[PDB]
Ligand binder design. Sequence first.
Ligand SMILES: CNC(=O)[C@@H](C)N(Cc1ccccc1OC(F)F)C(=O)c1cnc(C(=O)n2cc3ccc(C(N)=O)cc3c2)[nH]1
Length: 295
Amino acid sequence: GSLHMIDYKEIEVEEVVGRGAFGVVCKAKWRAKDVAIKQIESESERKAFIVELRQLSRVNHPNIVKLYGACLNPVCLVMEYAEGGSLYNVLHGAEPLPYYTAAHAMSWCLQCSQGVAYLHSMQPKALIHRDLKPPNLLLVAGGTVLKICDFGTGSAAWMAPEVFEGSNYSEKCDVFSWGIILWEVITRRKPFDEIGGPAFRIMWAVHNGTRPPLIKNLPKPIESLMTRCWSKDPSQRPSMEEIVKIMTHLMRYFPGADEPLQYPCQHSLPPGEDGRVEPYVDFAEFYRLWSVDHG
Ligand SMILES: CNC(=O)[C@@H](C)N(Cc1ccccc1OC(F)F)C(=O)c1cnc(C(=O)n2cc3ccc(C(N)=O)cc3c2)[nH]1
């Protein structure tokens, strides 16, 4: 797919905004436009840089971050910038944390599934993301629109066990990750936070069948989707197209996802811990609206 070759001298490197999975990203100007630039830090990131460049130049989707072009001297990517923050910072970041609703949580997950289903529908082979997690997901438009980032592939908590068992694996690994993320936005908890120590400890746990705890009062239609997504056996996980369909159906019972995040929350996570956790979000309205349709 098309890319602007860009001359490094016609862009103005502003403020660093954060590190990606690899590289470093800065706000900047290019033809007086808001733009993010990503540059490699060390030489070990040049491979990731080429993968990302090749992969991102092929994709165009409203839930995937736009690539405008590149600069081959020095090596840098030029992307869309918008006001917002990572899903990680929205969920777990610095005070003050925003209030959000069940509708936001479900919409964020629908939007990620839409971008990933596009990736998995690529011809001749699926583009597998391989690193879906909230630090690689950006919220824009007042926290209502989700964009997938970091296509260059601390990620053990979201990794399907077949990937870190070094088996062969498919696009179903992304479905496992999406499932963990669904759990995370609903509970507002870090998956496997309690399992201390280095990463091999998470790997061991998940490899042996450990999953995040069940959620109190979670509707069965959502629970069923979530738990299928994190099936040990990848063939029992739904495809992303099926996820998109199911989440689209469910959204008719979650009005208000277009509301901006505007209110602060004092989020004290209540220790549930008897093998079940409370949702951060509230499902009473879902149940009310569902009963209106289904007796
Ligand atoms: C509260 N502060 C934050 O959450 C920081 C970490 N953040 C998001 C952000 C910045 C750099 C790298 C990663 C990142 O997290 C996530 F968005 F990928 C931003 O502030 C921010 C605001 N607007 C953006 C943005 O437009 N972009 C555009 C990006 C394009 C690609 C990548 C990437 N990692 O490949 C990050 C990008 C971040 N980022």
